[PDB]
């Protein structure tokens, strides 16, 4: 087997948007996990369910790698048991989850002179995500008892906005992106396997 | 009301990007989402 394709997800070009956040199925490779772990200065890199330095000696039935961009404040969202326009909103991981949440700042690739418009969030929704859900939908949210007939106004807006990310931002307020790589177990035969 | 002052707070997040306060548009969106959230 080759080489799992993890550069393609760490060092593409353009990330996802977090309310359509973009999932990636790794399988039938070998994973050589330290490239990972030295592909930049990363602000979060925390393991459920793994050891981190033990990646290179597992296998799992697949690696599924999810990807997007949010908000250095945004970031502590991305973590089972966490609430938040993010968490409920965008990307909800589920309690008992198995992988890891890895984030580093990106504000030299995606920030923007006159500001980066390219990345939205969901700001308005009924209820929250299930874990894993993926919400696209850009219907006129109904925040009143008047129908909205897909006309934006008074009581009802467009659910999405842009984060409009500016290098002269606060860190906080700064793009970061973020990888979230589930290892999934099945009864089955595993054929992600570390480099060792 | 609770309705007309969510408009009035959207209205200003929207006003603020549009005059390049961006960051504090930003702020005011984390305004919203906890102001719907109460009951």
């Known amino acids: ?196 | 009301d609770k309705e007309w002052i969510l408009y009035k707070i959207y209205e200003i997040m929207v006003r603020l990007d549009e005059e390049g306060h961006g960051e504090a548009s930003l702020m005011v969106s984390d305004l919203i989402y906890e102001f719907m959230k109460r009951d």
Request: hydrophobic share 35%; net charge positive; glycine share 8%.
């Open chain 1, 1 to 196: 087997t080759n080489l799992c394709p993890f550069d393609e997800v760490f060092n593409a070009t353009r990330f996802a948007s977090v309310y359509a956040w973009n999932r990636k199925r790794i399988s039938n490779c070998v994973a050589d996990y330290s490239v990972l772990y030295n592909f930049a200065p990363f602000s979060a890199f925390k393991c459920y369910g793994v050891s981190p330095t033990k990646l290179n000696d597992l296998c799992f039935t697949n690696v599924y790698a999810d990807s997007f961009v949010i908000r250095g404040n945004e970031v502590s969202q991305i973590a089972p048991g966490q609430t938040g326009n993010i968490a409920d909103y965008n990307y909800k991981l589920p309690d008992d989850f198995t992988g890891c949440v890895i984030a580093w700042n990106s504000n030299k690739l995606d920030s923007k002179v006159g500001g980066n418009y390219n990345y939205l969030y969901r700001l308005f929704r009924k209820s929250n995500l299930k874990p894993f859900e993926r919400d696209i939908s850009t219907e006129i949210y109904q925040a009143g008892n008047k129908p909205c007939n897909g006309v934006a106004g008074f009581n009802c807006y467009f659910p999405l906005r842009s984060y409009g990310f500016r290098p002269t931002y606060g860190v906080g307020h700064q793009p970061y992106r973020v990888v979230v790589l589930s290892f999934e177990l099945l009864h089955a035969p595993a054929t992600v396997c570390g480099s060792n």
